């Protein structure tokens, strides 16, 4: 019981931090792949961080939808931006 509650707990916390880092890297790779698929080569795309206020998610999504003046292949489910991924 003590081992599982202390050593296993600490190992799980470290593994969770490592998995979070790996998932962020994988999300970056996926965003790069999408920016190579949606947007056209050669690679010159500019990425932006994901930081946003806790209660401004809907407003930010609406603003991004308004600003997405590209990718008309959809109706005149995936976001029509060059890259769009919401985390946490």
């Amino acid at each position: 019981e003590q081992s599982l509650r202390v050593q296993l707990v600490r190992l799980a916390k470290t593994a969770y931090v490592d998995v979070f880092i790996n998932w962020f890297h994988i999300k970056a790779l996926r965003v790069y792949v999408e920016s190579v698929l949606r947007y056209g080569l050669p690679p010159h795309f500019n990425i932006k961080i994901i930081a946003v206020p806790p209660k401004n998610l809907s407003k930010c999504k609406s603003e991004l939808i308004d600003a997405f003046g590209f990718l008309g292949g959809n109706a005149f489910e995936y976001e029509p931006f060059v890259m769009y991924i919401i985390n946490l």
């Binding site: 949606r38 292949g73 959809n74 995936y78």
Partner: protein
């Protein structure tokens, strides 16, 4: 490239889903059929439209073919070359004329 026909109602949906699932670019030159054709599955003379499309990548082409077949679209091996397309059209026309003749004979015999 790929070539096929599909009901003119679902051609816009097919184009949209193809442009969405394949985030990359592709060429689409659909043309509506002149006259409605009796659908085999629907047993109705619904409208039709062409499904001509061209894209690179063998896996991408296979996925596009699978998606088109998923939407009850029948495809044919249309020759890109004008001479080959003309030869295929002539062969199809001769086969269709022979089929028309034998169909007329069979229908007349059955009716009699």
């Amino acid at each position: 490239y790929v070539t096929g026909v599909i009901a003119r109602d679902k051609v816009a949906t097919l184009e949209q889903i193809l442009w969405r699932v394949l985030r990359g670019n592709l060429f689409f030159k659909t043309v509506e059929i002149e006259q409605p054709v009796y659908d085999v599955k629907t047993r109705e003379y619904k409208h039709k439209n062409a499904f001509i499309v061209f894209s690179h990548g063998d896996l991408i082409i296979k996925r596009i073919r699978k998606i088109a077949e998923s939407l009850d679209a029948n495809l044919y091996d249309v020759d890109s070359s004008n001479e080959g397309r003309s030869q295929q059209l002539a062969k199809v026309n001769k086969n269709l004329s022979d089929l028309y003749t034998v169909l007329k004979t069979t229908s007349t015999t059955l009716e009699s």
